[PDB]
Amino acid sequence: QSALPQPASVSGSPGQSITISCTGTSSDVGGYDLVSWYQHHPGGAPKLIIYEVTNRPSGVSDRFSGSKSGNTASLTISGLQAEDEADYYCSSYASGSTPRIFGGGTRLTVLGQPKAAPSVTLFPPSSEELQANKATLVCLISDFYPGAVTVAWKADSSPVKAGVETTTPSKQSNNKYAASSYLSLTPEQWKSHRSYSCQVTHEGSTVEKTVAPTECS
Amino acid sequence: QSALPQPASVSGSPGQSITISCTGTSSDVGGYDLVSWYQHHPGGAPKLIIYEVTNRPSGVSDRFSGSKSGNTASLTISGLQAEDEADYYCSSYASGSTPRIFGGGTRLTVLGQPKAAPSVTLFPPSSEELQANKATLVCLISDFYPGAVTVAWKADSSPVKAGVETTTPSKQSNNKYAASSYLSLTPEQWKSHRSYSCQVTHEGSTVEKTVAPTECS
């Protein structure tokens, strides 16, 4: 059931041609010609737009097309239109105990303004919280576009996932996106390291902020 | 192509069973033995749980069950658990250009979950932030249920409404909610006053936390 990786976000400006990849193995995408693509709007019926790797149902724009190469499959959309914004999913027959596996889905955005890198602000544990036998880190992520980032926390140099909660991006006044994440942990774990960091990747570019336990008065 | 009506949503209490119908026709559900069901959390990869009407991938709990009655298909979930909350979709092979069609999905909610009190963690402005002439107090609200709550700020005991931004609650890893409220203010503002507070009211009960101009960090 392990999701075939798909980029969370893909963007382009009107008239541009875009590509969405679906990565699999030789036990599915790569070993069979049974890949399907679906167009979907949150809280709506998925719509099959490509079956058996390259076949398109009558009624589906010819601007959409499916391809496969090696263990990766792709859905290419040329002449991007505002209406084309949706979530696209891929799926493939699989030889395992699960007949068909799906991709994590890709949210397609049609650029309505230039790409904007995220602003990150990291807040360390407040003494009051520590002096309550509790520790928590907060990482604020605002003003980015398209609305999708990947967040990873680091205990000095090692990534930490347990104890991490990250919200999905929501559109803000200015049309850009905001999101937040926090790392829960013990005061001991906090003082235990040289630092903790919040890494936010956006469109292949990473922004990292750091904090460190500092003994005061 | 043709759709498959499913109830928009359904609910039940722990230990109860539920049924989700997939009203089709002799051209789809009743025309073949190829009905599938999927579990899905918004933003993630759909998981196949029933296929060929009654078959089930091993690894999927036997509490989930698929059946057919003429042109309508059903998903029956025995002894509901909190963990079963998700969106469920059906699909079926179909005559016509489109090989498979899907229902609009049903959102399953599990009632009776235990009420939980939110833990409020109040953060003083970020050093990097204050250093950039900006100041933001962060009131992190986590681990509460149901996901409804109201916030209120105070400056040296007086209500403050300007510069307040409060996000809408979202579920976390556990089946509990998390939300935040932000208070914007200038650094001079942060120093001038002495005690800013964040009052969170969850289900009648009201918890509050406070902060003030630190000294070292």
| Sign of the alpha-carbon dihedral angle for A155, A160, A163, A165 | positive
3-state SS class at A107: strand
Residue pair B103/B88 in contact (Cβ under 8 Å)? The answer is: no
> Residue A208 belongs to what H/E stretch?
strand A205-211
**Structure determined by:** X-ray
- Please report residues of A whose CB lies closer than 8 A to that of B124: 126
Beta pairing partners, A92: A35, A101
Q: CA-CA-CA-CA torsion for B124, A179, A182, B210, nearest 10 degrees?
A: 30
* Single-letter residue type at B181: S
The 8-class DSSP code of residue A145 comes to B
Question: What b-and-e string marks burial along B123-161, b requiring 16 or more CB atoms within 10 Å of the CB?
Answer: bbbbeebbeeeebbbbbbbbebbeeebebbbbbeeeebe
Spatial neighbors of B91 by CB under 8 A, at least 6 apart, are A46, B4, B35, B36, B37, B38, B100, B101, B102, B103
Report how far residue A68's alpha carbon sits from residue A34's, in angstroms, rounded to the nearest whole number.
10
**Total count of residues recorded for chain B:** 217
CB B170 within 8 A of CB B142: no
Q: What is the DSSP string of chain B?
A: ---B---SEEEE-TT--EEEEEE--TTTGGG-S-EEEEEE-TTS--EEEEBTTTB--TTS-TTEEEEEETTEEEEEE-S--GGG-EEEEEEEE-SSS-SEEEB--EEEEE--PPPBPPEEEEEPPPHHHHHTT-EEEEEEEEEEBSS--EEEEEETTEEE-TTEEEPPPEE-SSS-EEEEEEEEE-HHHHHHSS-EEEEEEETTEEEEEEE---S--
Q: Which CATH class, in words, describes the domain spanning A2-112?
A: mainly beta
Domain ranges of chain A: 2-112, 113-213
| Pairs of residues, one from chain A and one from chain B, whose beta carbons lie less than 8 Å apart | 124
Q: Which of the residues B126, B141, B177 would you substitute to probe the A interface, choosing the one with the greatest number of A C-beta atoms within 10 Å?
A: B126
Which of A47, A51, A99 minimises the CB distance to B57? A99
CATH superfamily of A113-213: Immunoglobulins (2.60.40.10)
CA proximity to A121, closest of A152, A142, A95, A94? A142
Q: Do the domains A2-112 and A113-213 sit in the same CATH topology, yes or no?
A: yes
State the Cα–Cα distance between residues B210 and B208, nearest whole angstrom: 7
Complete edge-to-edge strand list for the sheet that includes strand B150-155: B158-160, B150-155, B196-202, B205-211
In contact, A213 and A126? CB cutoff 8 Å: no
Enter the resolution in angstroms: 2.2
The β-bridge partners of A170 are A178
- Alpha carbon A16 to its chain centroid, in Å, reads 22
Q: How many CB atoms lie within 10 A of CB B13?
A: 11
Residue A2's closest chain B neighbor by CA? Answer: B45
User: How far apart are the CA of B198 and the nearest CA of chain A, in angstroms?
Assistant: 14
Determine what percent of chain A falls in helix, strand and coil, rounding each to the nearest 5.
5, 50, 45
Instruction: Evaluate the omega torsion of the peptide bond into residue B146 and state whether it is cis, within 30 degrees of 0.
Output: yes
A209·B140 Cβ contact <8 A: no
Paired strand residues for B198 = B153, B209
Query: How far does the CA of residue A48 sit from the closest CA of chain B (Å)?
Result: 7
